[PDB]
Amino acid sequence: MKVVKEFSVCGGRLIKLSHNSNSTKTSMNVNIYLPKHYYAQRIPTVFYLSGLTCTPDNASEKAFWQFQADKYGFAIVFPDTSPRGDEVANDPEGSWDFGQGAGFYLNATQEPYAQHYQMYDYIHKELPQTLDSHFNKLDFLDNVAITGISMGGYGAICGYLKGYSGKRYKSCSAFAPIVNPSNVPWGQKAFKGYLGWEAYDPCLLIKNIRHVGDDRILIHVGDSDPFLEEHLKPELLLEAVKATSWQDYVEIKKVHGFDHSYYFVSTFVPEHAEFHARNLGLI
Amino acid sequence: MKVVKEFSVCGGRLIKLSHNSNSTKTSMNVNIYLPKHYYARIPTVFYLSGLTCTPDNASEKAFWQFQADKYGFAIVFPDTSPRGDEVANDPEGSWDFGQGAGFYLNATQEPYAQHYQMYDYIHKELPQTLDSHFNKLDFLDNVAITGISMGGYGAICGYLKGYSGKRYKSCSAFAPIVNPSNVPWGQKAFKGYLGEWEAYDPCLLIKNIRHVGDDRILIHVGDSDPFLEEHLKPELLLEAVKATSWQDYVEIKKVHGFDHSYYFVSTFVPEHAEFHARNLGLI
């Protein structure tokens, strides 16, 4: 990887990285915050997945994970949301809910997009291996957390479930996530375009997975989220876990007056960082 | 004063406001964060933004809200100039003069004179407009002033000019311009807005102001700020006070590896909040 820029934040550094992805067939950007602990004298990683239209920079500047990262001793990674570029396909109608900035963390089967949109392998296979091979003391592969907002919240929950049998992720949280893509408009549009569905829908995945021990999924969502009722409906995961071993282990905190914005995100970042800090065995 | 939009942040709210200003003869946007305490004499901090910025940049990237909740203060984020097709702009299209770039002066030079009464806007008009619309918050008596770059300049300047009447009770700045008469952006601003100066330059102003008590200006600046050597030159304020009673009451903390970015601001917002909280008598 190439170091594009370095910003000192808190007692550590935010590092803007770029590399040539074999998953996406393109140059990809990613930011990582290294905690004060890395520069002192293994540090686990949280992966934060971003929402529609977002770059790595958005969450990095607006969420203030860095303070929590120094508080508990974790690194945090902010990947991009799609392949980018002139030779990369985009939404044919110019919409922002599909195409560049809108991969939905899927491995594209459908022909035009299939060439670049291999976003599942990017996030879960290639990127952590690129980071480990670059920086390596940082654990990018074993002791790992996953989180995200909206589209990103989906990807986090999805990744946690699919990898659950191999304990791929040691904790999962989400902010205002899409829980049932098969049944929301952005989700449908995504699956149609990228795929042409079940192995990628959490509300279906969670039925077939035997819950373990104390494991749970922390969810936060605001009741003044303008997309809640039509596009998010995090509550349908609560329906899907009724009469399952996961019943009582998805807790959705519906929080009063809050938005879809990074004002909402930044508010509950501390509580989430704690949740992950616990599950990574840091406190 | 019209409410443009509210957002719940931490245990309070940030409100994007707009009003018709007498100072500027224009509609102006202001963001204010009301802490947990106002929904449970609340003092107010005014944060002045740098070149090109709107009230939004600081609101989203500095994370004052957690601190405002912590100590019990309101914080106000005014805009940096009048705005609009009718309001004069830089004749060459530069970002350091004109729109986004009022330098907190009361302009005398003719085109800009119709609109750019930014010193009046900030110190005379706005806190009174806020006091009408909201009022107990204190927008007038127990108030602190701070800012970044152009805004840091504004904060020091406002603090000093009213120092004898105790206009503001606490002053700090992040990477300010301290000596506009000798840095390119300031020289351009003065020529452009006023023609001919002294009454707006802190380095000249401080020569004639009787220091008292343990009053002091806290300044942070990063040694990796690319604007340091040419445009800012805070140390000039330190040498300025060598002649005066202010000797030992301006402290510049030049911190290693830090930027001009809001990664820099957010890092030291916590200390600056404590500084103000102490001066406002909240702790």
Side-chain angles (χ1 to χ4, degrees):
Chain A
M1 308 189 297
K2 290 171 182 184
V3 173
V4 164
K5 259 201 286 181
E6 290 180 72
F7 307 77
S8 299
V9 199
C10 305
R13 279 194 223 150
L14 196 282
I15 295 154
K16 255 209 240 152
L17 293 151
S18 81
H19 75 117
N20 285 314
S21 175
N22 307 322
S23 304
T24 72
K25 305 301 170 192
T26 52
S27 176
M28 290 286 272
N29 303 317
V30 54
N31 298 8
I32 181 179
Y33 175 74
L34 289 184
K36 85 203 173 178
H37 299 236
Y38 185 80
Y39 301 88
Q41 185 59 41
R42 294 237 289 166
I43 295 157
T45 305
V46 184
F47 281 73
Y48 181 98
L49 309 191
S50 279
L52 278 168
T53 77
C54 285
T55 273
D57 296 320
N58 304 105
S60 301
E61 309 161 353
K62 327 202 197 70
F64 203 54
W65 278 105
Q66 299 86 341
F67 190 90
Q68 304 302 318
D70 273 16
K71 199 214 176 158
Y72 298 114
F74 62 73
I76 184 158
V77 183
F78 306 97
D80 206 354
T81 48
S82 71
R84 306 276 182 185
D86 279 344
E87 66 310 316
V88 180
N90 213 340
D91 185 287
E93 308 181 296
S95 325
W96 45 252
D97 61 349
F98 179 87
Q100 290 185 47
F104 268 91
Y105 306 102
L106 304 162
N107 293 327
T109 62
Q110 293 308 271
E111 311 204 65
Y113 312 104
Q115 205 178 325
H116 295 104
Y117 287 73
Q118 297 310 301
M119 288 304 280
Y120 195 100
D121 281 7
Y122 186 73
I123 262 67
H124 307 290
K125 284 288 159 61
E126 191 197 16
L127 175 62
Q129 284 192 304
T130 315
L131 292 166
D132 173 73
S133 191
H134 172 102
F135 286 91
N136 297 118
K137 215 67 187 34
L138 298 155
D139 187 354
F140 287 104
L141 275 313
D142 187 6
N143 202 36
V144 288
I146 203 163
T147 310
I149 180 104
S150 194
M151 169 177 82
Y154 151 68
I157 285 156
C158 200
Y160 179 68
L161 298 166
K162 291 213 88 159
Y164 188 85
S165 61
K167 260 280 187 277
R168 179 65 185 82
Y169 297 98
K170 308 313 196 291
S171 97
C172 182
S173 69
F175 297 87
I178 285 155
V179 57
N180 187 203
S182 300
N183 276 313
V184 294
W186 305 338
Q188 283 147 195
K189 158 150 209 163
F191 282 161
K192 281 178 196 288
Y194 298 127
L195 308 177
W197 283 26
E198 272 186 12
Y200 276 133
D201 190 312
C203 276
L204 295 161
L205 282 177
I206 205 150
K207 257 87 161 75
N208 296 324
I209 286 167
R210 170 167 267 255
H211 175 262
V212 168
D214 226 336
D215 290 337
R216 61 190 69 191
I217 297 178
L218 173 55
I219 296 169
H220 271 271
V221 68
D223 63 31
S224 297
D225 196 319
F227 308 104
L228 159 67
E229 296 201 305
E230 179 167 28
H231 298 106
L232 307 178
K233 304 152 164 294
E235 186 257 346
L236 299 180
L237 188 60
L238 226 60
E239 276 199 319
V241 298
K242 289 193 189 143
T244 302
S245 51
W246 288 86
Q247 224 207 302
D248 300 351
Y249 292 96
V250 197
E251 67 162 299
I252 301 168
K253 294 184 172 69
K254 190 176 151 206
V255 76
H256 188 40
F258 278 94
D259 226 346
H260 201 63
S261 80
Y262 276 86
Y263 289 108
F264 152 69
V265 180
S266 68
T267 304
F268 305 99
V269 152
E271 168 178 340
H272 277 233
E274 170 158 35
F275 178 81
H276 300 311
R278 266 192 212 325
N279 293 345
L280 300 172
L282 275 165
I283 63 159
Chain B
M1 198 131 79
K2 176 200 201 302
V3 177
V4 196
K5 194 158 303 204
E6 274 171 296
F7 309 78
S8 322
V9 197
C10 296
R13 298 185 204 157
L14 191 126
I15 321 167
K16 285 180 60 138
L17 298 159
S18 74
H19 71 284
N20 284 320
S21 164
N22 315 291
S23 295
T24 78
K25 313 289 185 54
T26 275
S27 168
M28 295 276 89
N29 308 321
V30 191
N31 297 5
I32 183 174
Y33 172 74
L34 309 169
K36 72 212 283 191
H37 303 250
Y38 175 87
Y39 304 94
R41 42 183 167 174
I42 306 179
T44 301
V45 174
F46 293 82
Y47 180 94
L48 306 186
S49 291
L51 296 160
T52 80
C53 293
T54 68
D56 277 347
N57 300 73
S59 302
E60 294 156 15
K61 302 172 209 176
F63 309 98
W64 280 103
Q65 298 82 345
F66 188 103
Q67 301 304 321
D69 263 27
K70 174 172 196 160
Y71 300 107
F73 64 82
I75 182 158
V76 178
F77 302 96
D79 208 346
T80 46
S81 77
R83 322 203 78 115
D85 304 330
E86 78 287 10
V87 178
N89 213 335
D90 182 285
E92 288 165 312
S94 316
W95 44 247
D96 61 340
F97 185 80
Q99 303 198 35
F103 263 91
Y104 309 96
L105 307 176
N106 288 322
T108 54
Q109 299 315 270
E110 299 272 18
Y112 319 107
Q114 182 167 12
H115 295 302
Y116 288 72
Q117 306 307 310
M118 280 311 300
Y119 191 94
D120 286 336
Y121 178 75
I122 295 294
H123 306 298
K124 327 198 172 205
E125 197 213 338
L126 177 62
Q128 301 271 352
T129 311
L130 293 163
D131 185 67
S132 295
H133 174 97
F134 285 122
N135 298 320
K136 171 87 205 291
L137 299 142
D138 186 357
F139 291 102
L140 299 168
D141 293 295
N142 204 210
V143 303
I145 193 157
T146 186
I148 179 182
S149 191
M150 178 182 81
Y153 152 76
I156 299 171
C157 201
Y159 176 66
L160 288 168
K161 287 161 82 54
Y163 178 80
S164 70
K166 316 210 202 65
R167 181 53 189 86
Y168 297 101
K169 318 287 194 215
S170 190
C171 182
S172 84
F174 312 78
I177 284 101
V178 301
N179 189 351
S181 295
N182 292 126
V183 290
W185 301 336
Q187 278 157 349
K188 191 188 203 90
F190 281 167
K191 292 202 219 169
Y193 294 125
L194 320 172
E196 213 209 63
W197 271 56
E198 280 73 8
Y200 292 109
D201 188 313
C203 281
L204 294 171
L205 277 168
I206 211 152
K207 300 288 177 170
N208 298 275
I209 299 172
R210 207 91 160 176
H211 177 268
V212 277
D214 68 356
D215 287 346
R216 68 185 62 217
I217 300 150
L218 179 79
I219 302 155
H220 272 89
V221 77
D223 62 16
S224 296
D225 190 324
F227 305 104
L228 183 50
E229 269 91 55
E230 196 188 334
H231 298 283
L232 282 24
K233 303 156 83 61
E235 334 89 75
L236 290 167
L237 179 67
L238 256 165
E239 303 261 288
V241 300
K242 230 156 68 185
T244 84
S245 47
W246 283 85
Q247 177 58 46
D248 272 47
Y249 294 100
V250 175
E251 74 169 324
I252 301 170
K253 306 187 152 174
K254 189 188 216 164
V255 282
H256 190 51
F258 282 95
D259 224 342
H260 194 87
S261 73
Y262 269 85
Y263 288 122
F264 163 58
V265 163
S266 64
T267 306
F268 302 97
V269 153
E271 180 183 324
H272 280 223
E274 180 169 32
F275 182 72
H276 293 318
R278 278 200 252 173
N279 296 335
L280 297 180
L282 287 166
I283 64 157

